Amino acid sequence: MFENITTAPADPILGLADLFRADERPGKINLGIGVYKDETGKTPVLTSVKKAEQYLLENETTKNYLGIDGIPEFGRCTQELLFGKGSALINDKRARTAQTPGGTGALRVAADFLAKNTSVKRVWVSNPSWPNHKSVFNSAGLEVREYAYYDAENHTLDFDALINSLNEAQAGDVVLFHGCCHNPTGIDPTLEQWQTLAQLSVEKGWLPLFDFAYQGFARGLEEDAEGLRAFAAMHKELIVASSYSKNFGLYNERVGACTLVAADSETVDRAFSQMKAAIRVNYSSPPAHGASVVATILSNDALRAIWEQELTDMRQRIQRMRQLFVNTLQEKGANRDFSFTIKQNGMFFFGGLTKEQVLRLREEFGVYAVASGRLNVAGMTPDNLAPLCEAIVAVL
Amino acid sequence: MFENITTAPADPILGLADLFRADERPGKINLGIGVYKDETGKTPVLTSVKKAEQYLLENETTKNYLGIDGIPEFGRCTQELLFGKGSALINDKRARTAQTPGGTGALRVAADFLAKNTSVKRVWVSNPSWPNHKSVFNSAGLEVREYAYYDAENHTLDFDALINSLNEAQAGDVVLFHGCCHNPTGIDPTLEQWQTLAQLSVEKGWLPLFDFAYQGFARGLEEDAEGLRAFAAMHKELIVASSYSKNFGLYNERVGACTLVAADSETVDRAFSQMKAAIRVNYSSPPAHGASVVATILSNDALRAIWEQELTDMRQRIQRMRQLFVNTLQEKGANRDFSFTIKQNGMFFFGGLTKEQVLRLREEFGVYAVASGRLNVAGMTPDNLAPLCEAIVAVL
Numbered sequence: 192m193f194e195n196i197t198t199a200p201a202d203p204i205l206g207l208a209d210l211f212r213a214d215e216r217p218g219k220i221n222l223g224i225g226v227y228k229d230e231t232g233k234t235p236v237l238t239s240v241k242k243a244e245q246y247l248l249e250n251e252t253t254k255n256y257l258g259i260d261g262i263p264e265f266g267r268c269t270q271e272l273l274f275g276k277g278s279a280l281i282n283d284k285r286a287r288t289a290q291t292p293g294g295t296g297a298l299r300v301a302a303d304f305l306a307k308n309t310s311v312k313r314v315w316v317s318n319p320s321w322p323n324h325k326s327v328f329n330s331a332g333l334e335v336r337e338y339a340y341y342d343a344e345n346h347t348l349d350f351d352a353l354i355n356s357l358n359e360a361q362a363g364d365v366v367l368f369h370g371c372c373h374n375p376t377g378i379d380p381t382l383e384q385w386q387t388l389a390q391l392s393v394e395k396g397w398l399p400l401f402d403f404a405y406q407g408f409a410r411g412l413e414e415d416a417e418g419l420r421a422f423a424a425m426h427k428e429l430i431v432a433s434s435y436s437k438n439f440g441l442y443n444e445r446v447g448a449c450t451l452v453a454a455d456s457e458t459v460d461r462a463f464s465q466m467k468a469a470i471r472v473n474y475s476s477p478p479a480h481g482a483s484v485v486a487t488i489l490s491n492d493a494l495r496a497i498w499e500q501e502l503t504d505m506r507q508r509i510q511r512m513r514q515l516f517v518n519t520l521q522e523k524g525a526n527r528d529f530s531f532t533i534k535q536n537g538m539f540f541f542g543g544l545t546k547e548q549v550l551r552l553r554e555e556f557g558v559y560a561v562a563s564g565r566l567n568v569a570g571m572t573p574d575n576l577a578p579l580c581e582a583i584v585a586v587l
Numbered sequence: 588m589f590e591n592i593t594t595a596p597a598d599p600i601l602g603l604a605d606l607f608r609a610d611e612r613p614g615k616i617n618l619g620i621g622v623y624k625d626e627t628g629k630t631p632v633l634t635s636v637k638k639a640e641q642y643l644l645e646n647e648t649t650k651n652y653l654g655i656d657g658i659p660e661f662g663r664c665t666q667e668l669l670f671g672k673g674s675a676l677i678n679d680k681r682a683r684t685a686q687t688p689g690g691t692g693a694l695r696v697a698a699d700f701l702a703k704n705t706s707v708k709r710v711w712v713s714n715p716s717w718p719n720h721k722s723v724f725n726s727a728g729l730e731v732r733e734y735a736y737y738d739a740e741n742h743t744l745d746f747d748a749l750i751n752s753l754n755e756a757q758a759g760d761v762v763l764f765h766g767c768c769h770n771p772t773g774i775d776p777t778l779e780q781w782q783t784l785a786q787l788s789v790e791k792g793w794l795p796l797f798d799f800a801y802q803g804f805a806r807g808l809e810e811d812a813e814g815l816r817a818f819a820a821m822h823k824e825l826i827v828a829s830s831y832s833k834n835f836g837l838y839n840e841r842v843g844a845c846t847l848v849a850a851d852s853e854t855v856d857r858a859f860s861q862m863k864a865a866i867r868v869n870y871s872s873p874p875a876h877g878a879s880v881v882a883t884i885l886s887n888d889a890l891r892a893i894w895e896q897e898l899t900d901m902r903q904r905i906q907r908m909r910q911l912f913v914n915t916l917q918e919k920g921a922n923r924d925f926s927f928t929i930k931q932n933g934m935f936f937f938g939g940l941t942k943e944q945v946l947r948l949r950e951e952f953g954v955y956a957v958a959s960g961r962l963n964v965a966g967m968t969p970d971n972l973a974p975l976c977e978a979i980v981a982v983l
């Protein structure tokens with residue numbers, strides 16, 4: 192039965208891990224997958240997380256199944272983090288949250304839900320966008336269309352082009368937005384541009400779907416959510432797929448959430464029942480450990496204070512490495528100004544390298560990056576910055 | 588967009604949890620969902636598990652993403668547990684294992700894989716069978732057909748009827764078998780019946796799919812796998828969806844595995860690449876905690892010895908409660924012989940109650956069981972056995 196199966200194409204991002212591993216050269220530098228690394232080049236477990244795990248080990252008395260939607264406390268803390276402590280959405284009980292295996296899991300659940308229970312047939316994603324967005328929605332049988340976003344010449348958000356392209360989007364179509372720290376461009380809409388998009392979305396009748404995987408890495412927890420909150424103030428319905436992989440450093444514990452918002456509690460409850468149905472036939476119920484840690488931290492004033500500072504330190508180290516990256520490039524004699532990367536939010540640097548330059552950096556220098564030219568700044572350290580820049584200058 | 592969504596039907600098993608919770612009557616007894624309970628009526632964390640978690644807390648240095656297929660050690664230990672320490676399948680590298688979010692997750696991955704990469708169009712399940720089997724495969728777009736299995740009059744395996752019904756199954760069809768502790772009948776094929784089924788399957792050209800969620804609860808770890816191993820000795824290809832939820836008491840950590848077997852390593856690798864593709868667009872990579880615990884226990888002689896004894900104690904308490912259940916029924920004056928339940932393997936008692944008797948036990952006595960008449964014996968304790976039996980006798 193498996194004689195004629197074709198070999199699946201490698202993932203453009205996750206597939207780098209296997210290549211980086213096979214490579215046996217000493218000075219190899221991994222700047223691919225978007226995981227945080229400290230000054231030592233390691234991806235440590237946060238202290239707040241380790242303290243929460245200690246707590247769980249000491250107080251957990253059972254591993255009995257969680258409900259389909261997961262830990263209730265986790266859902267409440269998530270909604271407050273997304274919409275604001277005293278949001279009307281929460282008070283009017285218009286939102287339901289399902290704990291999921293990561294933000295990717297959240298996206299898949301959203302996709303299955305839409306495909307089976309609504310008239311949705313098309314999803315619009317930015318150009319360029321996170322590669323797995325097309326793959327996930329296509330798997331659910333939904334077609335994916337792209338809308339203009341990045342101005343490759345000026346390294347900015349081409350708002351006029353964004354508006355023009357989205358006018359081809361029809362009422363009932365889903366439009367996907369990155370909450371903050373757009374992956375891979377690092378360029379986000381200004382608060383006024385978000386407000387304009389919110390208004391346009393209501394009038395055009397689009398169903399907004401936010402992929403919120405970097406809350407806290409642009410400016411701050413609350414600040415990074417203003418675009419989403421601008422949308423939530425005017426929309427009757429919306430879906431949010433968030434992740435705690437990066438801001439809690441819980442990558443492998445698969446911790447995320449899919450939040451559904453409707454006009455009223457009666458409607459969201461009915462709709463959420465079908466979302467639970469979609470979960471039931473996938474993995475049944477979500478993994479407890481990771482989400483337990485998150486709920487424990489967010490609900491304890493002391494632990495939350497430690498975590499928030501750790502998040503702050505992460506964001507600040509990336510920003511520092513960014514300015515240092517640009518400085519070292521000019522010092523090493525780069526024949527191009529990359530100062531535009533200072534305007535980018537998040538962990539990545541994007542827009543200055545071609546596919547061939549990336550391949551050459553890998554083959555000749557052992558520097559690993561995504562074929563699209565996306566570099567993980569969070570993977571840069573004071574120790575590998577010099578050789579990194581010498582390699583880059585060598586391929587320009 | 589969500590105005591016309593219909594309320595999804597409640598799950599016949601997982602939905603009991605919500606009903607049992609709403610119930611405020613004092614003496615309510617929960618015998619629904621198949622989770623183990625000790626003499627105290629609690630579902631404790633195994634000691635071997637708690638020791639492994641202590642180990643992880645002390646030695647884990649990162650939460651970085653696992654590969655798509657999970658922890659390699661977890662996969663090796665799983666294959667040895669399934670096929671035997673020195674199996675040819677392992678030596679000839681004909682099997683690949685993907686760590687999944689529970690056995691249900693394993694089933695979904697298998698379903699997506701089959702639907703997208705093979706000519707499979709039909710899956711055969713036993714009558715009666717675990718309800719979520721139909722739901723999971725149907726969700727992937729595969730039709731489900733039933734084959735005769737249980738003899739409701741004699742409370743035994745109707746082998747002749749099984750053979751007759753499966754003759755309508757065509758080459759290229761998938762036939763699903765419960766490794767041991769058939770859910771919900773508790774009636775398994777004898778080793779000779781397994782051998783006969785293995786031979787017939789090869790000649791008919793069926794693709795076997797084993798759901799192995801109770802290894803260790805029938806007779807023992809090795810013994811419970813002889814049926815699967817009989818199949819693995821004659822088949823070129825097969826799929827195994829196993830779970831560690833019950834034998835490790837890790838229900839909410841979602842720990843399972845989907846094992847793929849092919850004629851040779853070259854073929855299984857090609858096929859497994861497409862299985863990884865199916866995972867990639869679902870939840871990306873599996874949750875680490877639960878699987879880490881399992882790998883830690885199985886790979887450490889000391890911890891494994893403690894765990895195996897705990898598994899043994901679990902199996903033995905259920906068997907004891909079974910004989911006590913039958914004894915108390917006759918002592919309380921039941922007007923029917925239920926001694927046939929002694930022949931049943933696993934956590935359940937099945938075949939003696941009608942749908943109405945189950946409803947009445949719930950409404951009038953606060954006793955919760957599955958509408959099909961399946962009772963969780965593992966939920967019976969020396970303290971609730973008396974009132975339980977008085978209620979049952981009252982509805983016969």
Ligand SMILES: *Cc1c(COP(=O)(O)O)cnc(C)c1O
Binds near residue numbers: 225293294374446447
């Ligand atoms: C990290 C990320 C996610 C979700 O990641 P998970 O590891 O599955 O939680 C989703 N979308 C984008 C754009 C991301 O960067």
Ligand SMILES: *Cc1c(COP(=O)(O)O)cnc(C)c1O
Binds near residue numbers: 475621691692770
């Ligand atoms: C328990 C069980 C499973 C899998 O359960 P998970 O909790 O998802 O690991 C699968 N099939 C049957 C018949 C089961 O009893």
